[PDB]
Design a protein around this nucleic acid. Structure first.
Ligand SMILES: [Mg+2]
Lengths: 448, 42
DNA sequence: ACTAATAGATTAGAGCCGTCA
RNA sequence: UGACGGCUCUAAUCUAUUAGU
């Protein structure tokens, strides 16, 4: 018996400085924003991987359709959407040992086998990069589980873009089971697969598909997350910060501040007092030097309530005329609603205000144009809380929705949580594989 | 400014540190992909 | 001044399964 | 690791009290 406020969906930008809503529509209509003259690839693995990859790459150049194109737009062609050259006649290949005496990998000593395989792969890649004259841009790895984690950790020092594709992703036609049916049927989302792989390859080669153009100046975004690690004394260190979202005179930036500040305690998921100052100190100057001025208003996101003394220390650390707000987002809250009539759920963009601070927000509601709903079942809301800080609630409620579509790893219409927490989480498990890394790089290309 | 040919160790070290840190920060921070770097010196 | 046992209320890993009738 | 979502079991600290050597 309460009205629910509806917030209009934000919009994104595309080539020629014009506005749209769905990234796929802009790609199929106007393509990318910036252009790269081409990409030169490089592959590692077995010769079966080579022939399969070449076959798939030549398959990509022709258009493909979907089961129901209204649910997922068709793929018209790689060169059609982008115009960036990518061919199968400029591939370098380094052979791998094929006898494979250690065929017992999946049922043997995990640490030794993982270290040996990752050392072999990384050493071969390093030799190829440091010896061969031919230039390379990316690297695709095909292998026939704590496996993909170590691959990027050691290579992070050498600053080389990387990509991994499962051997069953490309040649799923013959990947049959004991019954004989494919284990991962892809007969309905092949076009969207091409969309995802093409956009990932385009980004990791240095191309920027799209940027936001409905943002306000003098604002900064930040996020924090915590992960579990136990080596000697169970130091719950984590504190792997991410996101900067600064705005210079013109442009968007996604550098972020990285580095595992330590919490030596056991269950104190709340931030340490000594480490708190360094985070904001390392965050401020990165924006300051680019934009020549201090950030008037700043934001802080999290996923766990934090104590008071950290907030105090931030308050003395923060400069004059800067508001600090900690936004807490919760996913597991039972608020199952129901449309009164029909076999059909509620929209997306509906917000419910219960008080001055707390709020319930929806993101997984059906698109008016997709003729269906993103969630398989009836969707569940998310909960937004403002722990500390004074600001306007309505602009915060509308502003989070604007950050629900900057997922570069895929081309879905939107993602439930804001991608800041997603980026922080993704950095977490990949930076903690090796403790010997010092001064990690400040780009998203290498570990995505 | 000008510190004469003396302190030539510092004279080369300051400039080389400046250029090296600039190049390293550009390589490890920016998003655009680059292949070559043309250094211009007066 | 720390060691066991019942609750409320937070809070993090992993593992399956479908892909929109 | 293609990527997203919906689920399914497992664990753990912070309060505030009680029984206890
Ligand atoms: Mg990925």
């Amino acid at each position: 018996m309460k009205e629910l406020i509806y917030i209009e969906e934000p919009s994104i930008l595309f080539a020629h400085g014009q506005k749209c809503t769905d990234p796929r529509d802009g790609l199929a209509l106007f393509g990318p924003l910036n252009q790269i003259y081409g990409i030169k690839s490089g592959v590692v693995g077995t010769q079966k991987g080579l022939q399969i990859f070449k076959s798939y790459l030549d398959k990509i150049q022709k258009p493909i359709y979907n089961h129901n194109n209204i649910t997922r737009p068709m793929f018209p062609g790689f060169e059609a959407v982008f115009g960036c050259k990518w061919e199968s006649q400029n591939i370098v290949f380094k052979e791998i040992t094929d006898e494979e005496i250690r065929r017992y990998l999946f049922n043997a000593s995990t640490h030794k086998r993982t270290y040996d395989l990752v050392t072999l792969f990384n050493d071969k890649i390093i030799t190829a990069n440091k010896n061969d004259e031919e230039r390379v841009d990316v690297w695709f790895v095909i292998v026939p589980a704590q496996f993909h984690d170590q691959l990027k950790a050691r290579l992070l020092e050498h600053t080389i873009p990387t990509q991994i594709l499962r051997e069953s992703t490309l040649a799923w036609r013959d990947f049959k089971n004991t019954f004989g049916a494919p284990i991962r049927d892809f007969s309905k989302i092949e076009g969207h697969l091409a969309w995802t792989i093409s956009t990932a390859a385009y980004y990791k080669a240095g191309g920027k598909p799209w940027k936001l153009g409905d943002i306000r100046p003098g604002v900064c975004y930040l996020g924090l997350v915590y992960k579990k690690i136990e080596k000697s004394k169970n130091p719950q260190n984590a504190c792997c910060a991410a996101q900067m979202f600064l705005d210079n005179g013109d442009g968007t930036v996604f550098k972020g501040e990285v580095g595992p500040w330590y919490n030596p305690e056991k269950g104190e998921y709340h931030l340490k007092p000594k480490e708190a100052k360094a985070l904001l100190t390392q965050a401020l100057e990165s924006y300051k030097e680019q934009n020549k001025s201090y950030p008037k208003e700043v934001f802080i996101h999290a996923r766990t309530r934090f104590n008071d003394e950290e907030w105090n220390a931030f308050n003395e650390v923060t400069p004059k005329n800067t508001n600090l707000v900690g936004v807490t987002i919760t996913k597991s809250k039972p608020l199952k609603l129901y449309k009164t009539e029909g076999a059909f759920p509620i929209m997306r963009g509906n917000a419910y205000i219960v008080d001055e601070k707390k709020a319930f927000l929806w993101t997984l509601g059906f698109v008016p144009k997709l003729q269906s709903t993103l969630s398989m079942e009836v969707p569940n809301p998310i909960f937004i809380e403002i722990n500390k800080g004074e600001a306007e609630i309505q602009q915060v409620l509308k502003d989070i929705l604007a950050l629900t579509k900057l997922n570069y790893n895929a081309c879905i219409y939107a993602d439930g949580e804001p991608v800041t927490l997603r980026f922080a989480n993704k950095i977490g498990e990949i930076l903690t594989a090796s403790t010997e890394i010092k001064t990690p790089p400040l780009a998203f290309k290498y570990y995505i």
